Amino acid sequence: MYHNSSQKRHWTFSSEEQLARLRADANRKFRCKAVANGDPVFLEPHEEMTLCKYYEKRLLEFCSVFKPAMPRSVVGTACMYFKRFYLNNSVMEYHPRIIMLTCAFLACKVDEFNVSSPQFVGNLRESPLGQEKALEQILEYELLLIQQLNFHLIVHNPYRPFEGFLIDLKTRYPILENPEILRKTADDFLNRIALTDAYLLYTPSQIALTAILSSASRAGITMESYLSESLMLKENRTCLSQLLDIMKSMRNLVKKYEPPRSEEVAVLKQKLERCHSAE
Amino acid sequence: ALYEYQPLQIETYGPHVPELEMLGRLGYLNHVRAASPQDLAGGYTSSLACHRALQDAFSGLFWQP
Amino acid sequence: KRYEKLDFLGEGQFATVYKARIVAIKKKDGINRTALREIKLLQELSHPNIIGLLDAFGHKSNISLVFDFMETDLEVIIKDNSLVLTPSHIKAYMLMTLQGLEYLHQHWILHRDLKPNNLLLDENGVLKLADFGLAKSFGSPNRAYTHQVVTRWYRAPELLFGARMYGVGVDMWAVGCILAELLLRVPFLPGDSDLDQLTRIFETLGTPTEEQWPDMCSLPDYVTFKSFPGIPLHHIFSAAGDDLLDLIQGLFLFNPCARITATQALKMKYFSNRPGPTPGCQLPRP
Numbered sequence A: 001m002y003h004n005s006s007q008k009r010h011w012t013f014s015s016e017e018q019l020a021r022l023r024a025d026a027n028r029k030f031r032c033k034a035v036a037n038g039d040p041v042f043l044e045p046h047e048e049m050t051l052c053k054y055y056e057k058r059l060l061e062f063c064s065v066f067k068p069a070m071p072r073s074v075v076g077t078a079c080m081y082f083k084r085f086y087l088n089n090s091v092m093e094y095h096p097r098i099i100m101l102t103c104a105f106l107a108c109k110v111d112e113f114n115v116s117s118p119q120f121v122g123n124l125r126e127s128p129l130g131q132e133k134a135l136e137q138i139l140e141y142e143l144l145l146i147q148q149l150n151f152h153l154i155v156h157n158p159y160r161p162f163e164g165f166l167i168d169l170k171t172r173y174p175i176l177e178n179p180e181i182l183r184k185t186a187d188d189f190l191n192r193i194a195l196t197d198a199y200l201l202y203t204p205s206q207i208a209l210t211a212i213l214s215s216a217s218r219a220g221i222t223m224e225s226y227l228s229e230s231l232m233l234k235e236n237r238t239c240l241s242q243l244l245d246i247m248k249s250m251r252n253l254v255k256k257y258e259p260p261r262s263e264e265v266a267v268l269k270q271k272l273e274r275c276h277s278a279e
Numbered sequence B: 001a002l003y004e005y006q007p008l009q010i011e012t013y014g015p016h017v018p019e020l021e022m023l024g025r026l027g028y029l030n031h032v033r034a035a036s037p038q039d040l041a042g043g044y045t046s047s048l049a050c051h052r053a054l055q056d057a058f059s060g061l062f063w064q065p
Numbered sequence C: 001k002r003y004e005k006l007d008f009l010g011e012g013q014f015a016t017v018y019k020a021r022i023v024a025i026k027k028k029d030g031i032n033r034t035a036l037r038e039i040k041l042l043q044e045l046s047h048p049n050i051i052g053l054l055d056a057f058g059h060k061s062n063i064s065l066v067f068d069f070m071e072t073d074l075e076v077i078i079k080d081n082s083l084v085l086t087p088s089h090i091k092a093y094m095l096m097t098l099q100g101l102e103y104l105h106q107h108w109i110l111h112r113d114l115k116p117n118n119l120l121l122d123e124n125g126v127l128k129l130a131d132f133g134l135a136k137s138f139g140s141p142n143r144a145y146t147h148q149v150v151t152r153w154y155r156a157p158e159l160l161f162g163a164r165m166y167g168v169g170v171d172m173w174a175v176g177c178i179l180a181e182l183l184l185r186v187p188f189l190p191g192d193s194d195l196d197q198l199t200r201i202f203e204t205l206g207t208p209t210e211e212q213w214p215d216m217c218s219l220p221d222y223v224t225f226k227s228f229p230g231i232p233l234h235h236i237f238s239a240a241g242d243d244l245l246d247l248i249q250g251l252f253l254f255n256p257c258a259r260i261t262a263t264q265a266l267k268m269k270y271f272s273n274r275p276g277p278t279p280g281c282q283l284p285r286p
């Protein structure tokens, strides 16, 4: 359960500033190692963030075309693995192209989505020799990925909390007559939230509730009563204020999100290839 | 030194979740899919899925890092 | 890494376990899915009657898991003819097992491998559920499970009849079996095959009918059987009291839904009644 999970204890951070500090520390640690091994070949932390967002998009595409069909739980677990890995590791050391596939592989194992290794690597659009090379690299990096996650493999996604909130709305909130007309727009907002860093900053229940109430606001429905009358927050107004602040901050994180740009990702990809050639 | 049952005290940092046996009266089970006869024969009930969904929805809703 | 690798402890299909300075270290598909299952489940759980995963580390596709060191298990206790299992001892073992199971079931996980040698005991007499290699999360309508979990002598009839969806009953039945093995000092239902296991179950407890198991005929491997009336529980457990017989009947109810859950078993008068469970420090030591 989330309330005593490793995700809550160790992978839910206080602010975007702490995440930026971890990412910058990883960047400077790789820079120091590269210098001690021996210039503008190095990637700046914002460039690393752009590449990580691009490769998270690539991981989502890979998990969406995966055959047999990958449960949404596996995709969420893999994306969380990618986010956690590149919090404390530079893309200049470990290539995100390999790391995202390793994330998907480990996620399929952890969430009990049994697929054999050949049918995993067959989903890749490469030659059989290329598929076996990718398989070898995934096997090399699986233990590394597990180590960098600190052996915290269970990821609590917001999809089941979303379902629970829908059940609760259908049962206890007749004001919102048909909660199922919120599902599509709330799912779209959930995808948008997943693009950002919110999965490292908020609880899955908070994320699901934020998506639901954003969908309700988009439809024009004002359902603060459900927060006050059904969640019993009218008995604790400070908790209600904290909850509204959390949801406002999440909506702000979504509105300020900037997607990777094609020219910029092309330039940074050539830079990353140069980085990996020399290492 | 007689044993006395104490319920598990685990803070959920969220709203109270209705008990499993009470889901039927409160109307929750009218919104979860019914359990098939083979599901019931093995001990699986729609109450389990509904209860887990509600618990996950309410877990840590009021918690902040 | 930081461990001394003192003594060899055991070897099984997926791993070999050694003592190490005190902890127990257990050493193209990649990392073994049983080790990953143990890692992913035991990291999220923390309870006095559940085995603790203290550390994890490995090389290549070979990971080593660090657990607390356990002195013995219930199998050695049951098979040791020197020690006498007083009713207090059975109550204590049952209580620790059921509390660990209550915690585990609260977090929507089924052990699916309960048996006396999977219930380990430390020097302080604390019983911990171990061997989470088959343990799986339950309560999800999208997860389809296999019916070949639990060793045969402790497998529930719905599992033997091929249930792909089940709940805590598969643990609870095994618990009942363990209880019976504690009372008889021998395996309760020692079948040599699935059909023989079902035969022994129905010959001992009676063949369940549609009144005691409303949808028993809908299980995919349900086989129509011979109507045995069974043997009354007070005849099998001649030394058992009425409260213990109530607990046994609840644990061995053929309907998995009607079968008592861990919390319901804990609330039963058997555990509240005299005598109280033995303290851990006074439980018998093999």
Ligand SMILES: CC(C)c1cnn2c(NCc3ccccc3)cc(NC[C@H]3CCNC[C@@H]3O)nc12
Pocket (backbone or CB within 6 Å): C009, C010, C017, C024, C025, C026, C051, C067, C068, C069, C070, C071, C072, C073, C076, C117, C118, C120, C130, C131
């Ligand atoms: C890996 C962890 C669960 C563990 C902690 N102590 N310990 C011991 N101790 C020696 C022992 C135990 C039981 C009976 C006699 C001796 C033995 C052992 N053997 C591996 C299996 C064997 C079958 N029963 C479950 C065990 O985990 N695994 C462990």
